[PDB]
Ligand binder design. Structure first.
Ligand code: CDL
Ligand code: BCL
Ligand code: BCL
Ligand code: BCL
Ligand code: BCL
Ligand code: BCL
Ligand code: BPH
Ligand code: PGV
Ligand code: CRT
Ligand code: Z41
Ligand code: CA
Ligand code: FE
Ligand code: MG
Lengths: 49, 42, 259, 318, 43, 42, 277, 44, 41, 43, 44, 38, 43, 40, 43, 41
């Protein structure tokens, strides 16, 4: 896209930052919890070391 | 207009937003490289 | 497709977690709709900073929404901004959270239970554009139900049982056929004041209207209307608020405490 | 004491309101309105008129066929004895097909009549939904009622159609009867290991409890400020008066936060809708992705553990 | 006849008539499907 | 007079309605011939 | 903070007890005498709940899982006397704290009602919820003769109590007062969705439309069901449905055990045994 | 027959007609799927 | 003795009497819960 | 099709579309995880 | 044929059509995943 | 809304529907090649 | 520290502190009553 | 929506360009997914 | 760091801070009492 | 759009960066101690 900066003319680049930071945190929490649910990728109960 | 943001401000915000997102992606890539070295999933 | 997502995760667990994300988003939406009235908040936090800090909590305020009033009465924005208003009272103590003591005569202070906002100075209109709250003298097709006592001619008594006047007329809602106000002719100066039906206790056997809110002598200072045959939204609040102040100001014993 | 605004002391009679005019090409409203005195003491005295359009007429025909089939099978189940019909009426019902038929159409008395009653009732409910959609549209109103009705329909379809199809058996569906559908409700929980441990059953109860909480709060709130004309909620929403301010301030002083005269109805709308949305989801999860809710709760650390003061020797473990 | 439409609204009657006929048609097909002797969707 | 549609307006819609219905019935007839070839039901 | 229109309503007086001593606000909350009492009733009750969780049923079963935390009432062998703290006595103190907190909350609402000059419908409606709680932990246990009939204080353990009490009557759906209470609950939820929908659909009309009137509200449900209860009466009806549901729920549980010990379906044998059939 | 549209509104009739046809189509497809002899989603 | 300029002596007595009675009830009930000190046996 | 934005608000459409894609992305990932053949988190 | 859009609003038709098609497309994929003959995620 | 916009929308609607149906036909041809259902 | 009373008013603070101390005192006594080794009413 | 054809042509241009970019990496993802474990 | 008090109200900070510390202090004591390894009242 | 001038935005950013850096410093030291105590990978 030659002009992608024009996105900030229709979405406020303040509530977008809050939404992005909240969204990334929740997604990051979810993926960690998904891995903890897994018998292979649970790094706290795998006994290694 | 819609967001009270001028064309110059949007150019300013986009440049650093891209820079911050690029650096965030860079940390993510390093994290996944370390994760792949630790325990690959594919 | 199976019920198990991992060794521990299953579809039911994902579905309940999916609901919590939606429910969290829903509460944020509802809280945002809640804050369309009375925001930004009034606080010493704002007062001490000279308006530099707005108290809105979380979530912050939403964009203004438009209510297009019928019969081109104007468009009102819900998250609006109102002019600062000065209360008719002084604090009992200077610490934050302390209450206020109304100045002058509490009934006429317009503070506390007698406080009221300044609503629009126009009558509420029916679907056809006629004034909604009108007396029975102009709502001719309206009439009292046959099995119910006609309020006209009943005696109005105050909190102390003293006669305050007689019901000269009944004001009814034209859109929904119910009684709203009793027009009382005060037997002190012959000036007709409105008595909201919510402050009226009918005594059918004695044809008496009991008003526990205020004394008989307080009917002389009930706010009056500019036009005798219609009442604006502004005047409805003023009349109702005056009687409401009586529930706390009519007698010394009403301020409490019981013990 | 003070007027509590629970009953209307003095009612006023006006000529019956025909209704807001409908757009061109609409059927005239049927019925000459009357005035019930006792209905006017608690509410509005006028009964009627009603609008019965094409969709409402079709819903009536489909609905009667379902009810007639249900009642006929109830009467058949007591061998036509109308006296025994009245005696056993609460216990009578139209059973769904037996498990061995799966999703196929069984004979009439072996679940075939149930499918017809289920289909005709479903069609009348869907037709009634279209009717609620059109009445709101004809008056220029929004479709909040249709959305809420669709949420209730979703739960109704989950009970009798969607879940039985997912399970591959009509025998999982709800019988048409007063006590029989209560027996189904109890058996459903028993069969799938104590529905109390279904988290969407827990949520549904929270919203059903919350609906009674909100309506008690909102209903008492509006009656408390009705002396300031708080019942005229449209006016309070468009032009905030002292009734709406005192109502909001009461709840702010009580629990630290408050709604508006408009947003309290959004809380009300969502609490009621989420009752049946979570109800439908919890039903769809049961038997499809969860076999035993208590064991699911044990797996996820939700069920409490009690000291083993009483235990039974398992006779199968020998 | 023909004057039956002076007391019966043709608009309301046709919808009620067509709705009843559609319900009746669905009902009969359902009954035949329920009958093993007349179910046409078997082997 | 109950729908606000003139004789010509009703005449022209009926022409399109009949033509559209005919094409729909044509596709339906073809679909059933194919269905019969796949698995006859009588 | 306070709402932008709130300052003119913050008036001294209207307290039932305490006068000017506790008549103040903490943030948005009004405290008063019963706010102070209610807060420390609640604080002690919560702290004893946490302590009850800390000791648990026993050392091995102790858990801080919020779903599994449970403070149980005494054994029925203790009757209506006090039990040792770790054998149900903690439940008895927490119950007393809960009653103190709930009544203080209701009485604090009364003081707020007096300050605002509004009706007392809200504290009156809340008293029904308190009365239902009082039936569960006071009236029914006293009628049954033991504090051990109260429900345990745990998010999931009090569901196990409801389940087992229900199956003490073999089929609790046949409880006639339970059926009536459920009818009011379901009707209330239906009436709440209808009322919320009607208000929202009128104040938020179709795109490019003005706010509708009271005529539209009455016309809408008359067009659907042929009757409109009215803008004022729907709030009476909603209050009546919600309070009737709780009243009949209190009846349904207080007759289960104290006034009926057989299976609930057997109660309907009065109808089945009528000589008419 | 063209006068049927002087009785019934073409817009409302077309929506109702399409709605009934779609529900009828789902009904017939579901009946065929429910009948084992005509269930095409079985691999046989 | 300056405590009475911040606490109204007439409201305090009601709260004080309510507090002491509630405290006395709790102690009696705690003793009743203790078999060693339950005097009603 | 540039005219499609005459009737669809670019701000409303964009956020709704991005939310739609995210839940679809979650749905497909989770469906694959439920399938033992495509579950990449298992050993 | 083009005359249909006089009565049917294009803005409302498109959103309803897109919502209907997505639900229909989602339903068919779910039906196929349910049927063992056409479940492509079983590995066989 | 007007008469002239009706043909304008219809032309884009028909082409968009035709393109959507075209992809659908291709997908079903591929689906039939993968695993025929009749 | 005398300026803490310029921050915390002696009205709300002095009654909150006494309530917190009383609940804290009750809690500790209840904790000891619940501990068999420190229950002084055990006999 | 109060959006004239002047501003509805460059929003579409970016929207199509962004959609092509989004669809571009989707295809690469599915090619990698197909190589890892084909589903047909 | 003295400028944090030009951002945060000292009165609102102390109430939030003191309330948090008291709850945190209770929480840790409760956690220790819930573990028999650090319960100091068991014997 | 926050009422914060250019100088305060830079001044707040400077103290924020230092406070975040020191907090990150303590966190790193804590995790090094945690890793020595009981490594998790
Ligand atoms: C599925 C169903 C179940 C779901 C799970 C439900 C779980 C239970 C939910 C519990 C919710 C508790 C809410 C407590 C509110 C406390 C007051 C408050 O500040 O409100 C904050 C907030 C509004 O904040 P605000 O008033 O805009 O902010 C004022 C300024 O910030 C003012 O500035 P500030 O500096 O004062 O701000 C500090 C603020 C900070 O507040 C917070 O940190 C948030 C607190 C809640 C979290 O705290 C205060 O304002 C109070 C000041 C300190 C006093 C505290 C002690 C009071 C003693 C007197 C008591 C007398 C008795 O209100 C809420 O968050 C309400 C949430 C409602 C959740 C409902 C979910 C349950 C119902 C679901 C079903 C219903 C249908 C759904 C469809
Ligand atoms: C499972 C195998 C590994 C592991 C594999 C991975 C992989 C792979 C990743 C992580 C990532 C993260 N892991 Mg890890 N992680 C593990 C165990 C943990 C444990 C734990 C106690 O067990 C914790 C607390 C964490 C925590 C974290 C976070 C630091 C980070 C996600 C932050 C985020 O969502 O920002 C989102 C929210 C924001 C607000 C981001 C803001 C971006 C700004 C603009 C950029 C500057 C940031 C600024 C300086 C503030 C710092 C915040 C940082 C995001 C930390 N991991 C195990 C041991 N972890 C992700 C990551 O590296 O993110 C950086 C990631 O990709
Ligand atoms: C033994 C079972 C036989 C069978 C034996 C019969 C017999 C016998 C009859 C039918 C009839 C019908 N069958 Mg068959 N039918 C079978 C299986 C099917 C299957 C299937 C998937 O298996 C389907 C979809 C149908 C469908 C139909 C309908 C086309 C028709 C009922 C229409 C109706 O009720 O109108 C009522 C609903 C309305 C809305 C009426 C209004 C009509 C329209 C809206 C107005 C048009 C006006 C116009 C001028 C009048 C002519 C209309 C004509 C229908 C063209 N049959 C099996 C194979 N079927 C009936 C029939 O032929 O009717 C025409 C009939 O008598
Ligand atoms: C196997 C079990 C049986 C059964 C056995 C029982 C038993 C036992 C009971 C019920 C009770 C009820 N059952 Mg039953 N019931 C069954 C099946 C059903 C079904 C169904 C769909 O099958 C339904 C809809 C119901 C419905 C009902 C209600 C009528 C009633 C619960 C509402 C109530 O009591 O309000 C009352 C509300 C309260 C008590 C709430 C009190 C609120 C207090 C005052 C405030 C607390 C404040 C709080 C601490 C604040 C926290 C602070 C936070 C920060 C907010 N039951 C099955 C068949 N049922 C209960 C009942 O009737 O009790 C009266 C009851 O005891
Ligand atoms: C199952 C086999 C593989 C796998 C197979 C696939 C396949 C196949 C796909 C993915 C896709 C995704 N996978 Mg994967 N994936 C796996 C496991 C994971 C795990 C994990 C915890 O293991 C995670 C976190 C992910 C995460 C992701 C996301 C990066 C992505 C979904 C994007 C989305 O939902 O958009 C929804 C949200 C939005 C659209 C928001 C809009 C905002 C963004 C920025 C849109 C930008 C548009 C455009 C690109 C802008 C650029 C323009 C230019 C700069 C000018 N996968 C496993 C290991 N995965 C999809 C993908 O590649 O999408 C990109 C995809 O097709
Ligand atoms: C291993 C278990 C050990 C134990 C190990 C520890 C350890 C380790 C610590 C404590 C700490 C505390 N322990 Mg210990 N403690 C044990 C058993 C107990 C028992 C008991 C009955 O068994 C009690 C009542 C206590 C009580 C206490 C508190 C005195 C203190 C926590 C106070 C607090 O949270 O402040 C938070 C609450 C506030 C700050 C509210 C303040 C209210 C007023 C309005 C503000 C005034 C501020 C004032 C001007 C300045 C404060 C500091 C001054 C210099 C004093 N411990 C057992 C035996 N305990 C902590 C401590 O020493 O803190 C000082 C601590 O680190
Ligand atoms: C009677 C009709 C319905 C109703 C009405 C109603 N409830 C009300 C009100 C009204 C009118 C209020 O004014 C009042 C309020 O403030 O609402 C916001 C309230 C209220 N109803 C509430 C909850 C509630 N209502 C319920 C039910 C109902 N309330 C009925 C269905 C339920 C159910 C069904 O479970 C709950 C959980 C609160 C949000 C609030 C009262 C708040 C209160 O009393 O605060 C004081 C107590 C605390 C701050 C904390 C608790 C302190 C205790 C010592 C803890 C122990 C509690 C318990 C004994 C153990 C834990 C319970 C277990 C089961 C987990
Ligand atoms: C889902 C559709 C949501 C919008 C809607 O309610 O569309 C309705 C479509 O009715 C219809 O299905 C047709 C109604 C008759 C068919 C009966 C079954 C309907 C199922 C839905 C009404 O449409 P109009 O407003 O008349 O145009
Ligand atoms: C005036 O009336 C007379 C006297 C003429 C007749 C009187 C009748 C009477 C007294 C009837 C009484 C009825 C009663 C008491 C009914 C009680 C009903 C209850 C309590 C029902 C409760 C729940 C029922 C549910 C939830 C049923 C749900 C069923 C569904 C959703 C079924 C869907 C079925 C479908 C869509 C069928 C598909 C069939 C397939 C195979 C396509 O068909 C071929
Ligand atoms: C003081 C008044 C009561 C005096 C008697 C003491 C209590 C005993 C009552 C009667 C006992 C008895 O023998 O009754 C037998 C018959 C047979 O019982 C019934 O029919 C009563 C059924 C239950 C009715 C309610 C009883 C009260 C319980 C509390 C209800 C609270 C409702 C509101 C909650 C908000
Ligand atoms: Ca490890
Ligand atoms: Fe309302
Ligand atoms: Mg049965």
């Amino acid at each position: 896209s030659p002009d992608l900066w024009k996105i900030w003319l229709l979405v406020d680049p303040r509530r977008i930052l809050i939404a992005v930071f909240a969204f990334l945190t929740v997604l990051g929490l979810a993926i960690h919890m998904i891995l903890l649910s897994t018998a292979e990728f649970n790094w706290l109960e795998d006994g290694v070391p | 207009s819609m967001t009270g943001l001028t064309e110059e401000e949007a150019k300013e915000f986009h440049g650093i937003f891209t820079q911050s997102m690029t650096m965030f992606f860079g940390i993510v890539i390093i994290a996944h490289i370390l994760a792949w070295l630790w325990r690959p999933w594919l | 497709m199976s019920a198990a997502i991992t060794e521990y995760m299953d579809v039911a667990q994902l579905t309940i977690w999916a609901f919590w994300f939606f429910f969290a988003g829903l509460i944020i939406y509802l809280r945002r709709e809640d804050k369309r009235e009375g925001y930004p908040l009034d606080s010493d936090r704002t007062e001490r900073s000279g308006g530099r800090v707005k108290v809105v909590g979380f979530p912050d305020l939403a964009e203004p929404k438009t209510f297009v009033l019928p019969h081109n009465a104007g468009t009102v924005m819900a998250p609006r901004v109102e002019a600062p208003t000065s209360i008719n009272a002084t604090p009992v103590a200077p610490f934050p959270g302390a209450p206020f003591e109304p100045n002058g005569d509490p009934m006429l202070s317009g503070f506390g239970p007698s406080a009221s906002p300044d609503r629009a100075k126009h009558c509420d209109l029916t679907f056809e554009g006629l004034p909604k709250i009108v007396p029975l003298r102009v709502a001719t097709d309206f009439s009292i139900a046959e099995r119910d006592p006609d309020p006209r001619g009943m005696t109005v008594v105050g909190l102390d049982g003293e006669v305050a006047g007689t019901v000269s007329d009944v004001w009814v809602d034209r859109s929904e056929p119910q009684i709203r106000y009793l027009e009382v002719k005060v037997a002190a100066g012959g000036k007709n004041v409105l008595l909201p039906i919510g402050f009226s206790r009918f005594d059918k056997k004695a044809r008496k209207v009991k008003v526990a809110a205020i004394k008989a002598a307080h009917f002389a200072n009930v706010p009056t209307l500019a036009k005798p045959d219609q009442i604006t939204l502004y005047e409805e609040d003023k009349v109702c608020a005056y009687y409401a102040g009586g529930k706390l100001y009519a007698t010394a014993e009403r301020a409490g405490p019981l013990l | 004491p003070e007027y509590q605004n629970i009953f209307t002391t003095v009612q006023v009679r006006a000529p019956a309101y025909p209704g807001v005019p409908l757009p061109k090409g609409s059927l005239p409203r049927i019925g000459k309105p009357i005035f019930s005195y006792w209905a006017g003491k608690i509410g509005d005295a006028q009964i009627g008129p009603i609008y019965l359009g094409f969709t409402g007429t079709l819903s009536i025909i489909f609905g009667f066929m379902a009810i007639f089939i249900i009642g006929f099978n109830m009467l058949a189940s007591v061998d036509w004895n109308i006296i025994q019909f009245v005696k056993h009426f609460f216990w009578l019902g139209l059973e769904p097909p037996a498990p061995q038929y799966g999703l196929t159409i069984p004979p009439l008395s072996e679940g075939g009549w149930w499918l017809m009653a289920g289909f005709f009732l479903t069609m009348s409910i869907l037709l009634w939904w279209v009717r609620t959609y059109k009445r709101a549209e004809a008056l220029g109103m929004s479709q909040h009622l249709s959305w809420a009705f669709a949420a209730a329909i979703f739960f109704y379809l989950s009970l009798g159609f969607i879940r039985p199809v997912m399970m591959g058996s009509w025998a999982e569906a709800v019988p048409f009867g007063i006590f029989p559908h209560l027996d189904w409700t109890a058996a459903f929980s028993i069969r799938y290991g104590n529905l109390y441990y279904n988290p969407f059953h827990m949520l549904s109860i929270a919203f059903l409890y919350g609906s009674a909480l909100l309506f008690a709060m909102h209903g008492a709130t509006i009656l408390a400020v009705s002396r300031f004309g708080g019942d005229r909620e449209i006016d309070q929403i468009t032009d905030r008066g002292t009734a709406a301010e005192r109502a909001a301030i009461f709840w702010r002083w009580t629990m630290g936060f408050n709604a508006s005269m408009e947003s309290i109805h959004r809380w009300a709308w969502w609490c009621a809708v989420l009752t049946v949305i979570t109800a439908g989801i919890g039903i769809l999860l049961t038997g499809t992705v969860v076999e035993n809710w208590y064991l699911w709760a044990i797996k996820h650390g939700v069920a409490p553990a009690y000291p083993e003061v009483v235990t039974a020797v398992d006779p199968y473990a020998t | 006849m023909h004057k039956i439409w002076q007391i019966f609204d043709p608009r309301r009657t046709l919808v009620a008539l067509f709705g009843f006929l559609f319900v009746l048609g669905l009902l009969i097909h359902f009954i035949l499907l329920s009958s093993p002797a007349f179910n046409w969707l078997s082997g | 007079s109950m729908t606000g549609l003139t004789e010509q307006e009703a005449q022209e819609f009926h022409g399109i309605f009949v033509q559209s219905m005919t094409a729909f019935f044509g596709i339906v007839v073809i679909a059933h011939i194919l269905a019969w070839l796949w698995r006859p039901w009588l | 903070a306070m709402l932008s229109f709130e300052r003119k309503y913050r008036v001294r007086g209207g307290t039932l007890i305490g006068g000017d001593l506790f008549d103040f606000w903490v943030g948005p909350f009004y405290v008063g005498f019963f706010g102070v009492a209610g807060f420390f009733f609640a604080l002690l009750g919560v702290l004893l709940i946490v302590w009850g969780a800390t000791i648990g049923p026993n050392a091995e079963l102790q858990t801080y899982n919020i779903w599994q935390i449970s403070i149980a009432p005494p054994d029925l062998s203790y009757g209506l006397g006090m039990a040792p703290m770790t054998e149900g006595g903690l439940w008895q103190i927490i119950t007393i704290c809960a009653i103190g907190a709930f009544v203080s909350w209701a009485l604090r609402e009364v003081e707020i009602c007096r300050k605002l000059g509004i009706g007392f419908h809200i504290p009156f409606a809340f008293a029904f919820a308190i009365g239902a709680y009082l039936v569960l932990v006071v009236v029914r246990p006293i009628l049954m003769g033991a504090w051990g009939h109260g429900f345990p204080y745990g998010i999931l353990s009090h569901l196990d109590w409801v389940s087992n009490v229900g199956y003490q009557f073999l089929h609790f759906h046949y409880n006639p007062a339970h059926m009536l209470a459920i009818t009011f609950f379901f009707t209330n939820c239906l009436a709440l969705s209808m009322h919320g929908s009607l208000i929202l659909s009128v104040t938020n009309p179709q795109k490019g439309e003005e706010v509708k009137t009271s005529e539209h509200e009455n016309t809408f449900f008359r067009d659907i069901v042929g009757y409109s209860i009215g803008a004022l009466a729907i709030h009476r009806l909603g209050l009546f449905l919600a309070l009737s549901a709780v009243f009949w729920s209190a009846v349904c549980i207080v007759i289960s055990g104290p006034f009926w010990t057989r299976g609930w379906p057997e109660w309907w044998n009065w109808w089945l045994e009528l000589p008419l059939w």
